[PDB]
Design a protein around this ligand. Structure first.
Ligand SMILES: C[N+](C)(C)CCO
Ligand SMILES: [Cl-]
Ligand code: NA
Length: 129
């Protein structure tokens, strides 16, 4: 599924992301925009052979099992495919574990390089929330 902007902001809020670990909703929307263009089916292979999955491009090195990332963990206890569902519940739940891991939203390099420090509220501007 490709979410609309305000559609995704609404789903994220309903699953308790808005201000989670102190990150306002625009931060999550901006990160998903640059990680996946709001497409739940987005995948991207990394140089190390791990893969990133879903709206927040969560990585198989640590967070999910895909059966093809040697030496990796599955700290969210999920198949990476669950991260590609139209229902964002597994991506949100695993994102809450990632953003709690110590480095906050710096875990997502596209958030640090394209969202951090910017006027992230613009991403939820005009949305009924
Ligand atoms: C969300 N991760 C930390 C797993 C990677 C970003 O693409
Ligand atoms: Cl933080
Ligand atoms: Na894994």
């Amino acid at each position: 599924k490709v979410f609309g902007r305000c559609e995704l902001a609404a789903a994220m809020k309903r699953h308790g992301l808005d201000n989670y670990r102190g990150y306002s909703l625009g931060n999550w929307v901006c990160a998903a925009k640059f990680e996946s263009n709001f497409n739940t089916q987005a995948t991207n292979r990394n140089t190390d052979g791990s893969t990133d999955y879903g709206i927040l491009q969560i990585n198989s090195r640590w967070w999910c099992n895909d059966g093809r990332t040697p030496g990796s963990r599955n700290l969210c206890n999920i198949p990476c495919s669950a991260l590609l569902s139209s229902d964002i519940t597994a991506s949100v739940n695993c994102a809450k574990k990632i953003v709690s891991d110590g480095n906050g939203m710096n875990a997502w390099v596209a958030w640090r390089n394209r969202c951090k420090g910017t006027d992230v509220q613009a991403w939820i501007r005009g949305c009924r929330l």
